[PDB]
Design a protein around this ligand. Structure first.
Ligand SMILES: CC(C)=CCC/C(C)=C/CSP(=O)(O)OP(=O)(O)O
Length: 290
């Protein structure tokens, strides 16, 4: 369709507009193999802040259709976009699929580097201890007391990062403290991560999504992320966005006049690497309303 070539053009436009490194060759190979799954599924375009003056650009899709579940991994492997290094990360997706009933999956793409991440969403929420049999990083188990103590133990999804050999764990915000700003202040303090502004803390009371990143090199929790949805460009708190990301919320491409957004705040060791902002445009306009 034209829908697919529209999507490839919008992304090169973003990558160029916002100074994001990219590889036309790489984009081609991804779209050759995955283009239709973009036009036919929940689809989002991301820019992040990991480097002060230039955004990176990503694009991702979410497969909710029962019959298609598992084809993302198959497609990824058969075409060579995801090849096996025997890495500690490389066995996780098969293990997850045998252990847990799966209700959604998705692929994340880096406009320069190609296929970056694969998500698995469990059917329903599970005690995180049920994931302890998997070849996750040792740092997951060794923080089991910390996961329970901060009510980060209702596990619903895995994100497997192949560029960084790291794993994201996703947590439902079941506990009354998750609607409290003091919980996010105390969580960032306990992790010795960079403190949040009061504006962000206020927003986090109606937070609903928490993610934790673990990797095989480090005995420490590498970073965490909070996610909030916003219905449209206007609903976005723009005092939390630097100028480059302000421009992105006004000019991010989508097939609706006023797309919704998912914003992500990554936090890591204070004075260290991983405290930045993520902006996801709801390209089709049907991810955010759900
Ligand atoms: C990705 C799609 C289509 C919908 C979900 C929006 C969402 C929660 C994205 C999170 S991907 P994330 O784990 O935040 O990626 P990292 O930067 O942590 O590697």
């Amino acid at each position: 369709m034209n829908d697919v070539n529209r999507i490839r053009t919008d992304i090169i436009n973003v990558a160029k507009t916002f100074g994001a490194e990219y590889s036309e060759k790489v984009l081609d190979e991804v779209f050759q193999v995955f283009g239709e799954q973009f036009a036919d599924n929940s689809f989002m375009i991301r820019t992040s802040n990991k480097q002060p003056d230039k955004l990176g650009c990503y694009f991702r899709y979410h497969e909710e259709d029962e019959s298609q579940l598992g084809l993302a991994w198959d497609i990824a492997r058969k075409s060579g976009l995801l090849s096996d290094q025997g890495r500690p990360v490389d066995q996780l997706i098969p293990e997850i699929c045998e252990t847990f009933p799966i209700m959604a999956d998705g692929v994340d793409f880096d406009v320069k580097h190609g296929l970056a991440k694969i998500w698995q969403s469990i059917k329903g929420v599970v005690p995180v201890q049920d994931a302890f049999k998997l070849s996750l990083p040792a740092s997951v188990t060794t923080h089991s007391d910390f996961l329970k103590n901060h009510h980060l133990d209702a596990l619903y999804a895995f994100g497997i990062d192949y560029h960084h050999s790291s794993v994201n764990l996703y947590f439902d915000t079941y506990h009354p403290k998750h609607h409290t700003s003091e919980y996010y202040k105390n969580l960032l303090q306990d992790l010795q991560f960079q403190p949040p502004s009061d504006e962000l803390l206020e927003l986090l009371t109606n937070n609903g999504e928490i993610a934790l990143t673990f990797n095989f090199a480090s005995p420490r929790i590498e970073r965490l992320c909070f996610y909030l949805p916003f219905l449209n460009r206007e609903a976005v708190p723009q005092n939390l966005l630097n100028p480059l990301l302000k421009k992105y919320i006004n000019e991010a491409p989508a097939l609706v006049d006023n797309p919704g957004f998912i914003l992500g705040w990554s936090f890591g060791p204070q004075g260290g690497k991983g405290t930045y902002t993520k902006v996801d445009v709801d390209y089709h306009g049907r991810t955010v309303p759900l």
